Design a protein around this ligand. Structure first.
Ligand SMILES: CCCCCCCCCCCCCCCCCC(=O)OC[C@H](COP(=O)([O-])OCC(O)COP(=O)([O-])OC[C@@H](COC(=O)CCCCCCCCCCCCCCCCC)OC(=O)CCCCCCCCCCCCCCCCC)OC(=O)CCCCCCCCCCCCCCCCC
Ligand SMILES: CCCCCCCCCCCCCC(=O)SCCNC(=O)CCNC(=O)[C@@H](O)C(C)(C)COP(=O)(O)O
Ligand code: SF4
Ligand code: SF4
Lengths: 96, 176, 208, 82, 114, 113
């Protein structure tokens, strides 16, 4: 930021870009190293009623896997999913 | 939702053909590269003057370990071995016994600083904020066994850096 | 069960169960089990003589097109007589789906190499030779890939110790890096961490 | 390689340079396993010494059947003109 | 008891493969002592090859000796192509290791190992 | 319309995609007739190949055939037809409609142990 305008103009001409608007050295625009203390929120289960853990027990809703076939008509052939939809070209910048 | 990099069919009119041939014969993109290098020649470099200038750190920084004390001189470690159960490297070795007034205190608190992965699970597993991983990172030794800390070295790091460690914990503990 | 519980995907569960029935009935010569996990991943447990006919099916069939071999894995389970569990992970980019093809062998039975289906397997099953000791028949260049050159034993076997049997150091008498039987200045401390209370009643096995 | 006496003397010369065979029992009909008392790998390195001397490759199925110097010299005679 | 083989149908083809692997090692030993510039003799390395083949001589299973032949071909391939260094070849010769106590009394004197 | 490139490297443009797909589908059905009729592979592959052949016969345009064959470019549809043909020629030799060659042991797929 302390570059004199001759070297600053020479540098902007050599780069081809306005370099001073976007300096890669950091100055007083950045955050303070000392911040105020936060007050972090609590989650949704920080309640005093209707908060039984058996209604929010994720690990105990995991089931063993459903055995579809085990060795102890004119039905349709299936795929593992519907086929993938063809991707749309970018409206932003397709390079076209 | 996708784009085609390098799918430009160039123009074949005499304007663009002569532009590309002047670029070939007069080296336009090479002078563009020289211009970008010349542009960085006149920039102020990013070099800080170490050791006199220091790289910026945060209060969360995980450096050298330290066993802390309560604000009475009593050490915070109540010999509970959570920091060595959680230790991913098994760098912490703890042996304990009741001392002469009946307090649950360690006799062996070793950290192998050459096993340690400096990940700070010990300071976040510690229920009483005894072990912390302080802000010192400039503690290179000349010998391997000087990086094998016992309880005396860690309590001395606590007594050495407490004025900084307490302020870092003060700045960070509402995120913990 | 909204905020902290993973949402169940019933559509993908139904589609993968249907395609598992599809594969099980097209190839009944080798398909032994078909199962779908509660987080909707399809496993096709097959017989090890049908490694090539199943995988060439899923790679080439127009309702499967599993053109990608994502991963190839062995798992040592010593309580089985066929202790090694060879796991193929396959990706169909056409149908945006994944399948798992599982099979088994012991130390002495060879498995047929799947480089004829996925050339990607060329290193993976070679790693299965290096880490587990499973031999792959009709492999192009089967040798070690990760262990040291004079390394005895297959490390990811569960009877192989964590530290090995040997360790290296430089010795200035013979002017050479040498191997010696392993001695640790601090032993690895073994932690018995398992709680004696049952964690998941859905996975309870029936007693004797 | 011309004469059978030279081939027999040359077989015996290869066997007497081979140090494990006692030269007191080294005869033309001395069996390697049950007379001389050799390992199987001893017979294998004998056959490789014969390939060093005579200069042609002897396969496995026709070196397993070479249990005495007479079988070796008859093999070398049958694989050449003489 | 009906198992799928690796290469050999019985022990005779297995011993054939053992024997050809032994031939390949026996031919290779002088080249190995030369180009790794080992400080052993050729006879010492050939005695080590005979030792490594007699260590596994108690095996009667064709699949197990087929895997021993396969791993021996792998070690030979790591030897001929210079993939091992001198150190990996000399790890067969446990030269920095002190000799272990063999009888009861010296094992009693040194420690608790049986 | 003579699509300039397929976008996929190594996959060249097919000049006549319709006749190529018709030849590959009839060749798939001709090979697939040598599989027994009770096999599920023959039933399913005849079903999907008849669907694809009727869609190919029902559309003169190339791009509309690409949108309703639902397999991307027309050349990778052709490539999938070649792969299905090679697969069916292997399925005749493998004969995988046979019963299961060997049951697994009693706790072979029991997890956790
Ligand atoms: C061309 C030949 C050199 C002419 C002087 C020159 O170009 O000075 C750089 C001077 C400052 O350039 P800048 O990088 O934009 O200055 C930003 C600094 O932060 C502004 O400078 P600063 O804030 O850092 O001020 C402190 C600095 C002040 O800077 C100087 O004293 C510059 C060096 C003068 C020599 O002094 C020093 O750091 C002491 C350095 C002592 C040694 C310098 C080299 C001596 C070489 C010959 C022996 O360049 C110009 O003003 C443009 C070129 C003018 C050319 C005129 C015709 C000749
Ligand atoms: C310099 C260092 C070089 C190190 C080279 C290490 C190579 C290690 C290769 C080891 C490969 C083997 O051990 S295969 C041997 C296993 N064979 C068996 O268990 C069958 C028993 N084998 C035998 O009895 C052998 O003597 C014979 C020659 C096959 C038959 O003899 P029998 O008749 O009487
Ligand atoms: S440092 Fe903390 S976690 Fe570790 S034993 Fe002491 S009180 Fe427990
Ligand atoms: S930072 Fe991590 S590795 Fe280091 S002592 Fe703490 S828990 Fe162990």
């Amino acid at each position: 930021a302390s570059a004199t305008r001759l070297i600053q103009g020479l540098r902007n001409w050599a780069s081809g870009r306005d370099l001073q608007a976007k300096l890669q050295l950091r100055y007083q625009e950045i955050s303070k190293r000392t911040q105020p203390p936060p007050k972090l929120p609590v989650g949704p289960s920080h309640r005093l009623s209707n908060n039984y853990y058996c209604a929010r027990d994720g690990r105990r809703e995991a089931m063993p896997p459903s055995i579809v076939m085990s060795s102890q008509s004119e039905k349709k052939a299936v795929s593992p999913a519907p086929p993938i939809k063809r991707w749309e070209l970018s409206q932003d910048e397709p390079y076209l | 939702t996708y784009k085609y990099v390098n799918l430009r069919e160039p123009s074949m009119d005499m304007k663009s053909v002569t532009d590309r041939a002047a670029q070939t014969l007069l080296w336009t993109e090479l002078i563009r590269g020289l211009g970008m290098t010349l542009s960085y020649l006149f920039r102020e470099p990013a070099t800080i003057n170490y050791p006199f200038e220091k790289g910026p750190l945060s209060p969360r920084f995980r450096g050298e370990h330290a066993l802390r004390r309560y604000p009475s001189g009593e050490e915070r470690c109540i010999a509970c071995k959570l920091c060595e159960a959680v230790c991913p490297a098994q760098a912490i070795t703890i042996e304990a016994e009741p001392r002469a007034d009946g307090s649950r205190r360690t006799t062996r608190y070793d950290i192998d600083m050459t096993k340690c992965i400096y990940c700070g699970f010990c300071q976040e597993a510690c229920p009483v904020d005894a072990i912390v991983e302080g802000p010192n990172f400039e503690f290179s030794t000349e010998t391997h066994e000087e990086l094998l800390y016992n309880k005396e070295k860690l309590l001395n790091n606590g007594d050495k850096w407490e004025a900084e460690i307490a302020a870092n914990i003060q700045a960070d503990y509402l995120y913990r | 069960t909204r905020p902290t519980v993973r949402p169940r995907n019933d559509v993908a569960h139904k589609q993968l169960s249907a395609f598992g029935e599809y594969v099980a009935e097209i190839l009944p010569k080798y398909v032994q089990q078909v199962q779908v996990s509660c987080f909707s991943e399809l496993e096709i447990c097959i017989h090890p003589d049908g490694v090539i006919p199943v995988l060439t099916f899923l790679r080439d069939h127009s309702n499967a097109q599993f053109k990608s071999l994502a991963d190839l894995t062995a798992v040592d389970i010593p309580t089985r007589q066929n202790r090694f569990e060879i796991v193929y992970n396959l990706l169909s980019l056409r149908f945006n789906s994944r399948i798992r093809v599982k099979t088994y062998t012991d130390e002495l039975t060879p498995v047929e190499s799947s480089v004829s289906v996925y050339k990607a397997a060329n290193w993976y099953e070679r790693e299965i030779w290096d880490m587990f000791g499973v031999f792959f028949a009709n492999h192009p260049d089967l040798r070690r890939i990760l262990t040291d050159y004079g390394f005895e034993g297959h490390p990811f076997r569960k009877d192989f110790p964590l530290s090995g049997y040997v360790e290296l150091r430089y010795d200035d008498e013979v002017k050479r890096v040498v191997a010696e039987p392993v001695e640790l200045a601090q032993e690895f401390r073994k932690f018995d961490l398992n709680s004696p209370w049952e964690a998941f009643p859905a996975y309870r096995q029936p007693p004797e | 390689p011309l004469t059978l006496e030279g081939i027999k003397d040359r077989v015996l010369y290869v066997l007497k340079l081979y140090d494990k065979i006692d030269p007191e029992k080294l005869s033309v009909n001395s069996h390697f396993m049950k007379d001389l008392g050799l390992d199987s790998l001893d017979q294998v390195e004998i056959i490789m010494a014969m390939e060093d001397e005579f200069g042609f490759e002897i396969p496995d199925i026709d070196a397993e059947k070479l249990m005495c110097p007479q079988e070796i010299v008859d093999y070398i005679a049958d694989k050449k003109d003489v | 008891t009906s198992v799928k083989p690796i290469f050999s149908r019985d022990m005779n083809e297995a011993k054939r493969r053992v024997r050809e692997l032994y031939r390949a090692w026996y031919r290779e030993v002088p080249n190995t002592v030369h180009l790794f510039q080992l400080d052993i003799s050729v006879k010492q390395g050939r005695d080590k090859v005979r030792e490594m083949f007699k260590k596994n001589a108690h095996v009667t299973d064709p699949r197990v000796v087929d895997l021993l032949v396969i791993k021996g071909k792998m070690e030979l391939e790591e030897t001929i192509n210079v993939w091992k260094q001198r150190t990996h070849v000399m790890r067969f010769f446990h030269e920095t290791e002190a000799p272990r106590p063999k009888d009861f009394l010296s094992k009693f004197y040194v420690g608790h190992d049986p | 319309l003579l699509k300039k490139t397929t976008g996929l490297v190594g996959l060249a443009v097919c000049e006549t995609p319709h006749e190529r797909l018709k030849i590959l589908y009839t060749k798939i059905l001709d090979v697939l007739g040598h599989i027994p009729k009770n096999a599920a592979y023959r039933k399913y592959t005849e079903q999907i190949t008849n669907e694809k052949l009727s869609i190919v016969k029902a559309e003169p345009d190339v791009k509309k055939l690409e949108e309703q064959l639902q397999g991307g470019q027309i050349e990778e549809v052709i490539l999938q037809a070649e792969n299905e043909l090679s697969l069916a020629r292997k399925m005749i030799q493998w004969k995988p409609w046979e019963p299961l060659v060997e049951e697994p042991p009693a706790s072979q797929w029991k997890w956790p142990i």
